[PDB]
Amino acid sequence: VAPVFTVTKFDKQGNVTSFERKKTELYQELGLQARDLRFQHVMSITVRNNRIIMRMEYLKAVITPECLLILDYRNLNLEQWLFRELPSQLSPLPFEFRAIEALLQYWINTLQGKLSILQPLILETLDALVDPKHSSVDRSKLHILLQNGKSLSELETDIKIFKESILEILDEEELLEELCVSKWSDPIDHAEEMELLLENYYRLADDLSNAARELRVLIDDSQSIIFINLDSHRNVMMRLNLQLTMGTFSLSLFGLMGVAFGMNLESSLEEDHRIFWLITGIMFMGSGLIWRRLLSFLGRQ
Amino acid sequence: VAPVFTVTKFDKQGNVTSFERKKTELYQELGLQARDLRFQHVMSITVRNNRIIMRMEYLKAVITPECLLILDYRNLNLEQWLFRELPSQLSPLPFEFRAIEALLQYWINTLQGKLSILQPLILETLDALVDPKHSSVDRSKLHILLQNGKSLSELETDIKIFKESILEILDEEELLEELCVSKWSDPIDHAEEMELLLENYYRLADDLSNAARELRVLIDDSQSIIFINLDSHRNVMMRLNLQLTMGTFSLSLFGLMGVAFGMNLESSLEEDHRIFWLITGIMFMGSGLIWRRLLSFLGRQ
Amino acid sequence: VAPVFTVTKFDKQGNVTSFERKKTELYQELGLQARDLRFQHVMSITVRNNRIIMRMEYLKAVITPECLLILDYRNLNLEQWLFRELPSQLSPLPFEFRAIEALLQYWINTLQGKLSILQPLILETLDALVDPKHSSVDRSKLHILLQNGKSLSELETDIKIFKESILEILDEEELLEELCVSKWSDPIDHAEEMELLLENYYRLADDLSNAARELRVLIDDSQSIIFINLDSHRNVMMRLNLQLTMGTFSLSLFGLMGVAFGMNLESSLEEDHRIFWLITGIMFMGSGLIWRRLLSFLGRQ
Amino acid sequence: VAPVFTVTKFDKQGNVTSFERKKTELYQELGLQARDLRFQHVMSITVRNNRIIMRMEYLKAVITPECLLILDYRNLNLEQWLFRELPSQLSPLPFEFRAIEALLQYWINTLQGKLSILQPLILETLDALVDPKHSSVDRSKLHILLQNGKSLSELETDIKIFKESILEILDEEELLEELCVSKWSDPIDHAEEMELLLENYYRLADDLSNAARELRVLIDDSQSIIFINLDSHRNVMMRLNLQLTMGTFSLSLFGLMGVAFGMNLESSLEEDHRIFWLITGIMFMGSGLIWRRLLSFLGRQ
Amino acid sequence: VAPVFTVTKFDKQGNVTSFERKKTELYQELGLQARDLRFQHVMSITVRNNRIIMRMEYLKAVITPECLLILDYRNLNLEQWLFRELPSQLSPLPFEFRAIEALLQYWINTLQGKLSILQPLILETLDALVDPKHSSVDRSKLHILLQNGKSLSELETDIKIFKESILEILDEEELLEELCVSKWSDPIDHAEEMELLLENYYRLADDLSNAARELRVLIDDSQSIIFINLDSHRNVMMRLNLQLTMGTFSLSLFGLMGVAFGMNLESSLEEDHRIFWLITGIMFMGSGLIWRRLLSFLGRQ
DSSP states (O other), rough: OEEEEEEEEETOOOEEEEEEHHHHHHHHHHHHOOOOOOOOOOSEEOOOOOHHHEEEEEEEEEEEEEEEEEEEEEOOOOOHIIIHHHHHHOOOOHHHHHHHHHHHHHHHHHHHHHHHHHHHHHHHHHHHHHTTTTTSOHHHHHHHHHHHHHHHHHHHHHHHHHHHHHHHHHHHHHHHHHHHHHHOOOOOOHHHHHHHHHHHHHHHHHHHHHHHHHHHHHHHHHHHHHHHHHHEEEHHHHHHHHHHHHHHHHHHHHHHHHHHHTSOOOOOTOOOOOHHHHHHHHHHHHHHHHHHHHHHHHHHH | OOOOOEEEEETTTEEEEEEEEEEEHHHHHHOOOOTTTTTEEEEEEEETTTTTEOOOOOOEEOOOOSEEEEEOOOOOHHIIIIIIIHHHHOOOOOOOHHHHHHHHHHHHHHHHHHHHHHHHHHHHHHHHHHOOSSOOOOHHHHHHHHHHHHHHHHHHHHHHHHHHHHHHHHHHHHHOOOOOOOOOOOOOHHHHHHHHHHHHHHHHHHHHHHHHHHHHHHHHHHHHHHHHHHHHHHHHHHHHHHHHHHHHHHHHHHHHHHHHTTTTSOOOOOHHHHHHHHHHHHHHHHHHHHHHHHHHHHOOO | OOOEEEEEEEEOOOOOOEEEEEEEEEEEHHSSTTTTOOOOSSSEEETTTTTTEEEEESSSEOSSSSSEEEEEETTOOOOHHIIIIIHHHHHOHHHHHHHHHHHHHHHHHHHHHHHHHHHHHHHHHHHHHHHOOOOSOHHHHHHHHHHHHHHHHHHHHHHHHHHHHHHHHHHHHHHHHHHHHHHHHOOHHHHHHHHHHHHHHHHHHHHHHHHHHHHHHHHHHHHHHHHHHHHHHHHHHHHHHHHHHHHHHHHHHHHHHHHHHHHOOOOTTTTTTTHHHHHHHHHHHHHHHHHHHHHHHHOOO | OOOOOEOOOOOTTEEEEEEEEEHHHHHHHSSSOTTTTTTTTEEEEEEEEEEEEESSOEEEEEOSSSSSEEEEESSSHHHIIIIIHHHHHHHHHHHHHHHHHHHHHHHHHHHHHHHHHHHHHHHHHHHHHHHHTTOOSSSSSEEEEHHHHHHHHHHHHHHHHHHHHHHHHHHHHHHHHOHHHHHHHHOOOHHHHHHHHHHHHHHHHHHHHHHHHHHHHHHHHHHHOOOHHHHHHHHHHHHHHHHHHHHHHHHHHHHHHHHTTSSSSSSSOOTTHHHHHHHHHHHHHHHHHHHHHHHHHHOOO | OOEEEEEEEEEOOOOOOEEEHHHHHHHSSSSTTTTTTTTOSSEEEEETEEEEEESSSSEEEHHHHEEEEEEEETTTSSSHHHHHHHHHHOOOOOOOHHHHHHHHHHHHHHHHHHHHHHHHHHHHHHHHHHOOSSSSOSSHHHHHHHHHHHHHHHHHHHHHHHHHHHHHHOOHHHHHHHHHHHHHHOOHHHHHHHHHHHHHHHHHHHHHHHHHHHEEEEHHHHHHHHHHHHHHHHHHHHHHHHHHHHHHHHHHHHHHHHHHHHHHOSSSSSOHHHHHHHHHHHHHHHHHHHHHHHHHHHHOO
8 A cells, every 4th residue: 555644734824624645646746755755853844845844753744835734643642732722823924933833832832841740750759768767768769760760861852852953953044044935935034033933942942951950960969868878877777786786795705604603513612602692793793894895995986 | 901010110310210011011112022021031131123131030121222121020129229229330331331230240249149158058068077087977967968059050050041141142243233222223332342241241150150160079079988988987887796796606606515514414524623614714715716716817808 | 915805896787796806906997096995994984086985894885986896795794785685776866876875874774773682681671670679689680781781882982983974074065075976077966965865864873872872871870779779678687687686685685684593503592483483574574675665766866 | 548459560671669559540550440450350361452461360460561560469478489580580572472471380380389289199198098908998088188189179170261261362363463562552473472372381281181180080980999899898797797697596506405405394314414415416516517508508699 | 511302313215313412503403493392292293494393292203304303212112113113114205294104103003002902901800800709809900900990091181182183283274284394495285195194193093082982981880880799799698697687586585485494493393394395395386487477577578
């Protein structure tokens, strides 16, 4: 079966149509070639034969002086935006500016929504983890943090690609003039308006990038603080264990003393209770003294 | 209700007025459009129809050849600066230079105050943490350090944005000439003065950025030193525990020896005390010798 | 023996030949010199006397207006690509574009295959390692991860070299015109087509680089999470050991008490069982109470 | 009281004078304004009205075609350089070159001295710390290392500022011509000589920066090695403790066996010594065997 | 004594001479000044009065249209290269190209030898360290790794300096024309040949830099894997110790039980062996059950 695009077409007045068209007929209707409508790049803004070709992660658009076309919109939850919002936006400047503004605004709003969803989860998870009142931390929250960090990295990459794509155009004047397809098709400055639009969207993307970078550095700092807290708790517990170990060592030493003094043999000392009481008292007082001395030895270190 | 701006207006002589004006009337009074007075960017310096539009994190200003306007100043603690200091500053160069210098000086002073407040707290907290006389560190100080580091990152971002915004203007001569609104409105070089002003403020921002970077690297080094100190204390405590464990092992071994020699059974040796004394002495001397040998074995490792 | 190249030659129609030719004869047949056909660089695209010289890690190609030559193809598993696919590709634009597109597509497909093989292994290994249900992790998987990370770094380097080599050409127009060897040999714009080709391949390489960078940052985050999980498990185990140590300390203390009360000597208290029962009960209840008190002391910390 | 500068003035012949002059009189004597002699920047090289204004961290200089002035030299240990070395240096090229060379050489020598003092201390401290013959490290040396690293970061920042300040001038020819104040005051190429001077000093600064960077990376590597050594020692000590713990466990198990066999009750076995000897031998041999088996179990892991 | 250079001179035909000459006579013989033959920079390529001045870490060369001079070659192991290889290389292009190619090839070969020596040692050391079959790692190998990493950093710095020095020349055409001293001394394109030479050597240096960077990242990854392995072994050993501690706790608890039941007092139960056997069996079975329960409690965690 011949390959076919699923196109939805918007007119200047905002009227909407939708159909399925074979690629060869689409090329013939326009002045393009299969070399152009390939969409091999995730992000791209290009001009060919006075036709603008724009692509996002999952959005594909062709802009003409008299119409707009969105391609392969099925199973992407774009119906609400396509049939409810876009016609209102498209209804003194030419059509190209309206269409480009609509698409760029859609992408920017999508990125802003992603960031707004990501931020509170990460902040709350980090706040919960950093609580120094616990000697251990949950691991489900760690898994959540890892997944959200992956999503944040993807968002940063998308923002950087958007910025680079727009900047590549803003620098050269030739592309700025090319985007003014209506002027060239049928021979106030349009280049200035295009520059303003692209500058605005580039600045918004820069702000988003700065926010994401701040979030990432916050994550790193929280991780370091977590490490430090865990190490401190380890040291405290080891100190406690060491103190108890010294106590047990003294107790066992004088337990051996008593066991030796209490063998099932002849000692020639079983007829006196004074010696027994003296031995018990000596054991106890000496255990106290040696424990205190070992505590002091630990303290001096 | 129609949207309205809360404006405070400064004349050339420094006279001050304040009122509330609807946006449409404000656009009509000037030569601007709603596309300009939107303030969608956190930091922006722009020129439109010989009117300068400046924005900061929370400051919004419009500069004309004959007046200055500050918008949305409510609930921002700007009364002291607005009604006490600015009129004195504004009272041979045209008005634009005075206004721009005032605004930039205000922002720079704000950033300097933030940095001056942040520095001593971080320095003292790090000095307290790094003290090697403790095996553990407080965690409230760690939380304070984390919050102050977040604030420091925000400050660094603000400084970088300021530097980039000014540099974008300093490079191009067209914008430098545009900022000289008085010259164009009613046809010594003004561009040189503007270049001097922007260069001065850019250099001050660069100095602040360098200071912040130095503080951050200091924080990182302190964290590494903290880790090392904690690990060393851990190793010392483990060495102590190991020594005591070897002692206890020897004591328990010869305690088992004595217990076996002292069962409630027949041994055919209960009639001699010499054997008992010899056993006790052997136990004690052997415990000493084996403890010393184990200490040597630990030492060789 | 004189050095010799093993060449396979493709004509315009796609006909294929293969032979071995001495370097001097090859230089004489073309207009080149030994200074050119040296291949001292891993990645290089150059033009000399209207002949294109291209090199990859292990691929060496010479492009002329009428023929293509691949050199040193032995023992490299290139037979399938050389004798089955390339002739079909080479069979209105001149030959140079077809040849360059074929070579660049081959290299890009190779890199994509490498990345596609690497990704799932790393993802699955990291997912297995991060599982917080274990207190330890396998080390064979760690070795696998290390080797795959080394391969990923090599891939990133190759992609960066490819991007730099293409970009060095895209910027200058002189090289773009030079690559159009057919135009100069025998005096629609060819430079535009070359720019389109190189831009497409550069963008594909950029996408691959972004993917690799994302994978690397994911690896780093997973490593940090692994460290945190291990530390938490350590702390939990130490807490358990500390609790048991306090219990054992109490038990040994009152064991010493009982041993002292049960020496093989005279105590003047052996005729009463009430004292014995009271001592046993006191030991048990006191052990419980002291264990609870030590647990509370640990809790307060 | 009116603000006053403390100036020391050098003539062309090297004669030296020193006095205190009010700022207004200084401005009047030269052709400058208070906007220039403010010294709000830590590092700055500027030209105003054929007068060169130079600043360092604590050095302030004004250069004219016929004289040099150093401002605010009190309490800075500059007497030796001011009254002993500089006159000799200043005694065919004009005065500006000599003065600038002297100041830049002074700054470069200061930075070189700082680096030469810092290097050996850090190297020796790291060599002492890295010694793998100890399970712990001193902390006073760590504090010293931290302070010296802070000083190194400050030095790196100073070098970077110096390089940037000189480079900003080297690129533009206009500033190079401006620095030739003598040519313009009273109308072989001077710009070439200035370029040579600035290039020489920039290259020296670059060398210093490279040295500092190498030192910093060395510090980082030493820190990592320290961490690894501490962890290895921890593992060794834990292995020793585990072995001793298994031994103690076996000893205590068979101690319980013997204690149970030696209660103060009736066992119907007290009339035979063969059973007693067999029990003792069984306990000892079994303890040896179980200890060996546990050692093997540890080994297999 | 007057300062003197130790020079070795090569003629066009390759004839070699060597002598010692005072600096003033050397300046007079050429057209240079002491400002040039100072060699204050580690790496430098310069042109003065149609004389090329080149410096490396320890190599100093002066190139003229008719001769080459190497200065200060004593005690540097350059005799083999100076008196055996260089004359052969120097024996249609002018002399400058041959001399520059020889010097650059020498430096590149030196760097390649350094890298080839460094690589296998680091690879083998890392392979030995990463072996997960040991709970500890040797420290002599760590010291070796540290020293080799320092050497690698020095090599990277040298390569970067070489690349920067060559690139500074490649960009400007004026320096490329200046290097063609023979053309200017006594009035096919030489600039093209110089560009080819410098491009070749720059590309080789870039390849070396990439290799060094790959080695460094490999080192870092190996360090991280080492940390992870050590932590895992720590956790395993702690688990073993915890299990043995729980066993010992149960044993000591029921040892206290038996000791209490076996005091040297009156219990009114010494006439029955059934109670004794029941107590022993209860102790043993309960110890088994409590040990199993504690193992389950550890497992659930």
